[PDB]
Amino acid sequence: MSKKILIVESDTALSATLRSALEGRGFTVDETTDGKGSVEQIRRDRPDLVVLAVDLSAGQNGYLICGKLKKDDDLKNVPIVIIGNPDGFAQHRKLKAHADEYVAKPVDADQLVERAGALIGFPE
Ligand SMILES: [Cl-]
């Protein structure tokens, strides 16, 4: 009865750290550095939770990707945790297309594991 997480994050060092911690708890975890294809990957692979960074590579932006996901009638139900500079969190919460949760960088991997479990439950 696997719980699946996708990390959209071009900081591969951080993504690996987060992945190991989540996998340690029993989550299945995939990673992508590509924000451009992220929405369609989410539609294909159907993760139970998305961890989405703000500052992504090749001009991609987590708030904009979150916008597309939360305006999509099919995908707006998939929980999104935004990670990044906490400065912009308060503003984005006010938007209709806000994420489900916001975790400030520096992200504590153990803390994120607990926040993931609060959103989608823990592996059993
Ligand atoms: Cl970021």
Side-chain angles (χ1 to χ4, degrees), residues 1-3 5-73 75-95 97-109 111-123:
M1 47 167 283
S2 79
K3 296 178 173 60
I5 300 173
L6 178 63
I7 304 171
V8 186
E9 170 63 277
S10 51
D11 182 345
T12 56
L14 173 58
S15 187
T17 301
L18 300 181
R19 175 164 182 186
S20 294
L22 290 162
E23 284 185 344
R25 201 61 146 85
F27 292 107
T28 302
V29 182
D30 201 351
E31 295 173 287
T32 182
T33 59
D34 184 10
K36 203 175 211 178
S38 65
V39 172
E40 288 310 312
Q41 177 164 348
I42 290 160
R43 199 192 311 284
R44 291 199 309 276
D45 298 348
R46 290 276 161 167
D48 297 287
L49 175 79
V50 180
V51 176
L52 177 56
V54 174
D55 182 15
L56 294 166
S57 60
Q60 294 294 319
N61 185 93
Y63 294 128
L64 298 181
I65 293 163
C66 188
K68 300 204 224 74
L69 289 170
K70 294 298 188 185
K71 290 185 301 194
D72 190 286
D73 291 0
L75 298 175
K76 65 187 177 195
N77 299 307
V78 180
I80 315 297
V81 180
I82 293 283
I83 61 174
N85 181 0
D87 286 355
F89 291 173
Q91 289 170 80
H92 200 257
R93 286 186 183 99
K94 294 187 161 51
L95 300 184
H98 63 85
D100 303 74
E101 273 198 44
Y102 301 77
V103 179
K105 286 188 185 188
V107 176
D108 187 318
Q111 203 271 333
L112 185 66
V113 170
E114 300 301 305
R115 296 286 80 228
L119 292 169
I120 67 169
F122 293 100

